[PDB]
Design an enzyme around this catalytic site. Structure first.
Site, short mmCIF file in Angstrom:
data_model
loop_
_atom_site.label_atom_id
_atom_site.label_comp_id
_atom_site.label_asym_id
_atom_site.label_seq_id
_atom_site.Cartn_x
_atom_site.Cartn_y
_atom_site.Cartn_z
N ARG A 49 -12.85 -26.33 66.85
CA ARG A 49 -12.46 -26.48 65.46
C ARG A 49 -11.36 -27.52 65.40
NH1 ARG A 49 -8.85 -21.88 62.88
NH2 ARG A 49 -7.37 -22.97 64.26
N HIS A 530 1.86 -15.09 51.55
CA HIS A 530 0.82 -14.57 52.44
C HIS A 530 1.40 -13.46 53.30
CE1 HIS A 530 -2.90 -14.99 54.95
NE2 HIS A 530 -2.08 -14.59 55.91
N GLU A 531 2.45 -13.78 54.05
CA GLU A 531 2.95 -12.86 55.06
C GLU A 531 3.55 -11.60 54.42
OE1 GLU A 531 2.06 -13.32 57.98
OE2 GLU A 531 1.52 -15.46 57.83
N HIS A 534 0.91 -9.21 53.15
CA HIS A 534 0.26 -8.42 54.20
C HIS A 534 0.85 -7.04 54.25
CE1 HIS A 534 -2.76 -10.68 56.25
NE2 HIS A 534 -1.96 -11.70 56.50
N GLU A 593 -6.77 -10.79 54.82
CA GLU A 593 -6.28 -12.16 54.86
C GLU A 593 -6.58 -12.86 53.54
OE1 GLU A 593 -4.40 -13.56 57.07
OE2 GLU A 593 -4.46 -12.10 58.68
N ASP A 597 -3.83 -14.38 50.85
CA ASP A 597 -3.92 -15.77 50.39
C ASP A 597 -3.77 -15.85 48.87
OD1 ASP A 597 -6.43 -16.98 52.78
OD2 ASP A 597 -4.30 -17.02 52.92
N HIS A 658 -9.57 -14.13 59.30
CA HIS A 658 -9.43 -15.14 58.25
C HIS A 658 -10.79 -15.67 57.79
CE1 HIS A 658 -5.74 -15.43 60.81
NE2 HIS A 658 -5.16 -15.37 59.63
N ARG A 664 -11.01 -20.43 51.90
CA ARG A 664 -9.72 -19.90 51.53
C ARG A 664 -9.27 -20.67 50.31
NH1 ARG A 664 -6.46 -18.66 57.12
NH2 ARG A 664 -4.99 -17.88 55.54
C1 LIG Z 1 -3.83 -20.29 60.98
C2 LIG Z 1 -4.28 -18.85 60.77
N1 LIG Z 1 -3.15 -18.05 60.29
C3 LIG Z 1 -2.99 -17.81 59.00
O1 LIG Z 1 -3.84 -18.06 58.16
C4 LIG Z 1 -1.69 -17.17 58.56
C5 LIG Z 1 -0.55 -18.18 58.58
C6 LIG Z 1 -0.83 -19.14 57.45
C7 LIG Z 1 -0.93 -18.66 56.15
C8 LIG Z 1 -1.21 -19.53 55.10
C9 LIG Z 1 -1.39 -20.88 55.34
C10 LIG Z 1 -1.30 -21.37 56.64
C11 LIG Z 1 -1.02 -20.50 57.69
N2 LIG Z 1 -1.37 -16.02 59.40
C12 LIG Z 1 -2.12 -14.95 59.16
O2 LIG Z 1 -2.96 -14.93 58.28
C13 LIG Z 1 -1.90 -13.72 59.97
S1 LIG Z 1 -0.75 -12.71 59.02
C14 LIG Z 1 -1.35 -14.02 61.35
C15 LIG Z 1 -2.48 -13.86 62.34
C16 LIG Z 1 -2.34 -14.29 63.65
C17 LIG Z 1 -3.39 -14.15 64.55
C18 LIG Z 1 -4.59 -13.58 64.13
C19 LIG Z 1 -4.73 -13.15 62.82
C20 LIG Z 1 -3.68 -13.29 61.93
C21 LIG Z 1 -4.81 -18.29 62.06
O3 LIG Z 1 -4.08 -17.58 62.74
O4 LIG Z 1 -5.95 -18.52 62.44
ZN LIG Z 2 -2.43 -13.43 57.47
#
Ligand SMILES: C[C@H](NC(=O)[C@H](Cc1ccccc1)NC(=O)[C@H](S)Cc1ccccc1)C(=O)O
Ligand SMILES: [Zn+2]
Ligand SMILES: *[C@@H]1O[C@H](CO)[C@@H](O)[C@H](O)[C@H]1NC(C)=O
Ligand SMILES: *[C@@H]1O[C@H](CO)[C@@H](O)[C@H](O)[C@H]1NC(C)=O
Ligand SMILES: *[C@@H]1O[C@H](CO)[C@@H](O)[C@H](O)[C@H]1NC(C)=O
EC number: 3.4.24.11
Length: 696
Positions: A49, A530-531, A534, A593, A597, A658, A664
């Site tokens: 990706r 986002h965070e 959660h 997720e 968002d 996600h 998204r």
């Molecule tokens: C990049 C993506 N992460 C995210 O979308 C956001 C962080 C984020 C939110 C909004 C926009 C950009 C990044 N983080 C998350 O959605 C979660 S709370 C963190 C997470 C880490 C590992 C596996 C699953 C979840 C990913 O881990 O594949």
């Molecule tokens: Zn998340």
């Protein structure tokens, strides 16, 4: 009244080049936002990706390389050990020299790999039992096969640790793969060919006789075993309710309710459990409380396990460990993995060695490496600006509760309580810079040899596992951060009720002190929401201000939550993804997720509006005929420019919680009235459906 700052024409440059104006934003805002990026770039052969997030990650590794590769004279031991581990990892001469022989010397410690062993029943099968073999693999090397037992945080008391029992991970990415038909066939074939290829090299290196037919035959056996294990596991969708997942039991209940008969045991849970815990010298009696996450897996295990030889079990067990190891050996062992990862990931080549290695040291010495990263790469006053940002978005969440018509007052106020109680972690922990003693001491017990990568990796597996197990009777550390700082990501922990934003994501396009506020809110702003959101999604609403699994919803509000969120289940569940052969997203597995968002975008937008109220509106950016409302969503969108290899799309539709970045964008802005306003979208224009999902 155009902004003409260098920081202004930087981000404008980036916005301009990524977007494609030829496209009507109300028709497909992904193509609008990202169509410029799509045309210009191609997924590297080493990437499953690619896109802006992944680009940020490749750039982060470059800094890591810079900080790891040159010895420095006043390097404290902590940094010296990371550098040595890096150097040990990138010396392929030394690794190639060693062939497989560091695997060969391992195998006796895990009761062998039968298909690659003469007279295994004689050698190992006489002392063998499931309890010891699973336990050895688990306690010493942290590989959990058949029955996953681990020490973690107790969901119902977040200051304590408990023993858990859960279903094991599989060798293929998801239980679905084991249908082994259609889009899955090649992965299944490559998997067993991988088994076979590895058993062959081991046999050859040991100068044993090779009978291709009995290899094919044992390794297919292992596949049929795991197929059964796979089908016995519970779907993600049956696992998404943490109140249902949480079943606390005495080892004694467990013994009575979940009998197994392996190789003609029968199976003794206390012995299993003690064969693990006796390794941090801890004593378990049958009165121990245990959290069982897969009661039904365990019940289903019974009549499967009975059917199979000790030889058969151990052939799977060892394979699942050897899998991981083989790319830490000589090239021929690395080679043996080629088709497998091509099938799962689509990549035709491995990532550069220095990048793998940077990443590995990062993952095993995250504090040591975060300190180097931030000193190289991270600003310092960033921390202060994000804190205030976080305070803003937290307030907006609280204040928003008042407009939510689908909750009751008691529940809202308890939700308020939780917000205020969220613990934010920004950039990095000061300690990793300002406390050498502490930093050194976290790695005290490790010592790496520069010509001994494999032994280094093994040492880390044992260390990490010993450390984890040691926690059983200790309190959870309330100071621990849940991510290294050298990470392009952010995080929420329900157990801890904590949000974290490592230095690595605190950079454009999410954040800069010098870029337009439109951009920051639409970037790191919406990441913050986002965070936080959660904490209140289909999982993290089940935990209270203290990280305890306890119900603080009224029946009505809880039932409403399911109702409101069900709208998103359907919306996203109705997207189908070309790159995964038209298959639809799993609307349940992405729910949390997706909620994060949509909640986060809205929160951030509201905060930006508030910012404009207080502060006035921003100088425009040159090159762009868009106002700042518009740029807010543009930058939101461009966070997610990218695309997937087919093989990996088939992977993540099943394994990623996600939604893919394009959806998204699409799902979220579809739900956003504020978006169709900014871009003047006609009703039931594709981006402006009459029916819009909202929870937070
Ligand atoms: C990049 C993506 N992460 C995210 O979308 C956001 C962080 C984020 C939110 C909004 C926009 C950009 C990044 N983080 C998350 O959605 C979660 S709370 C963190 C997470 C880490 C590992 C596996 C699953 C979840 C990913 O881990 O594949
Ligand atoms: Zn998340
Ligand atoms: C790699 O390890 C080999 C074997 O010890 C050694 O000869 C060589 O000097 C090492 N190379 C580097 C650059 O460390
Ligand atoms: C577990 O039971 C086995 C039976 O073979 C025994 O040999 C071993 O000592 C036991 N281990 C523990 C930790 O009690
Ligand atoms: C699509 O949405 C409809 C209702 O809007 C729902 O009945 C259907 O199950 C959804 N499709 C999927 C696969 O989620």
């Amino acid at each position: 009244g155009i902004c003409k700052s260098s920081d202004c024409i930087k981000s404008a440059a980036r916005l301009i080049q990524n977007m494609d104006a030829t496209t009507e934003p109300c028709t497909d805002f992904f193509k609008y936002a990202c169509g410029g990026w799509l045309k210009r770039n191609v997924i590297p052969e080493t990437s499953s990706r690619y896109g802006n997030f992944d680009i940020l990650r490749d750039e982060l590794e470059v800094v890591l390389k810079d900080v790891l590769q040159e010895p420095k004279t006043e390097d404290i031991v902590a940094v010296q050990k990371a550098k040595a581990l890096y150097r040990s990892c990138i010396n392929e001469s030394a690794i190639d020299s060693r062939g497989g022989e560091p695997l060969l010397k391992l195998l006796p410690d895990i009761y062998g790999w039968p298909v690659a062993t003469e007279n295994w029943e004689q050698k190992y099968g006489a002392s063998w039992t499931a309890e010891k073999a699973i336990a050895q693999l688990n306690s010493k090397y942290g590989k959990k096969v058949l029955i996953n037992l681990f020490v973690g945080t107790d969901d119902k008391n977040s200051v304590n640790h408990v023993i858990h029992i859960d279903q094991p991970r599989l060798g293929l990415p998801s239980r679905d793969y084991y249908e082994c038909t259609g889009i899955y066939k090649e992965a299944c074939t490559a998997y067993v060919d991988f088994m076979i290829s590895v058993a062959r090299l081991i046999r050859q290196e040991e100068r044993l006789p090779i009978d291709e037919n009995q290899l094919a035959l044992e390794m297919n056996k292992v596949m049929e075993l795991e197929k059964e294990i796979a089908n016995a596991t519970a779907k993600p969708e049956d696992r998404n309710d943490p109140m249902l997942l949480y079943n606390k039991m005495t080892l004694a209940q467990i013994q009575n309710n979940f009998s197994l008969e392996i190789n003609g045991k029968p199976f003794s849970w206390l012995n299993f459990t003690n064969e693990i815990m006796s390794t941090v010298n801890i004593s378990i009696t049958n009165e121990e409380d245990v959290v069982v996450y897969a009661p039904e897996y365990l019940t289903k295990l019974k009549p499967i396990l009975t059917k199979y030889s000790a030889r058969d079990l151990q052939n799977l067990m060892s394979w699942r460990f050897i899998m991981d190891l083989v790319s830490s050996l000589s090239r021929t062992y690395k080679e043996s993995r080629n088709a497998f990862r091509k099938a799962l990931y689509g990549t035709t080549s491995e990532t550069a060695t220095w990048r793998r290695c940077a990443n590995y040291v990062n993952g095993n010495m995250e504090n040591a490496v975060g300190r180097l990263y931030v000193e190289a790469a991270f600003a310092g006053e960033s921390k202060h600006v994000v804190e205030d940002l976080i305070a803003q978005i937290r307030e907006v969440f609280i204040q928003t509760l008042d407009d939510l018509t689908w909750m009751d007052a008691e529940t809202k106020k308890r939700a308020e309580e939780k917000a205020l109680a969220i613990k934010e972690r920004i950039g990095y922990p000061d300690d990793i810079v300002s406390n050498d003693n502490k930093l050194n001491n976290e790695y005290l017990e490790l010592n790496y040899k520069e010509d001994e990568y494999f032994e280094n990796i093994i040492q880390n597996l044992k260390f990490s596992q010993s450390k984890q197990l040691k926690k059983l009777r200790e309190k959870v550390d309330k100071d621990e951060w849940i991510s290294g700082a050298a990470v392009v990501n952010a995080f929420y922990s329900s157990g801890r009720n904590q949000i974290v934003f490592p230095a690595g994501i605190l950079q454009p396009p999410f954040f800069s002190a010098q870029q337009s506020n439109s951009l920051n809110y639409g970037g790191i702003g919406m990441v913050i929401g986002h965070e936080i959101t959660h904490g209140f999604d289909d999982n993290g609403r089940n935990f209270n201000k203290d990280g305890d699994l306890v119900d603080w919803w009224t029946q009505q509000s809880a039932s409403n939550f399911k109702e409101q969120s069900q709208c998103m289940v359907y919306q996203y569940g109705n997207f189908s993804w070309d790159l995964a052969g038209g298959q639809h997203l799993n609307g349940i597995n992405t729910l949390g997720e997706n909620i994060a968002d949509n909640g986060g975008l809205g929160q951030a937008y509201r905060a930006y509006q508030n910012y404009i109220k207080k502060n006035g509106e921003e100088k425009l950016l040159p090159g762009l005929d868009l106002n700042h409302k518009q740029l807010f969503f543009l930058n939101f969108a461009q966070v997610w420019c990218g695309t997937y290899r087919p093989e990996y799309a088939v992977n993540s539709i099943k394994t990623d919680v996600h939604s893919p970045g394009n959806f998204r964008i699409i799902g979220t802005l579809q739900n956003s009235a504020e978006f169709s306003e900014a871009f003047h979208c006609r009703k039931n224009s594709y981006m402006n459906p009459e029916k819009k999902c909202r929870v937070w």
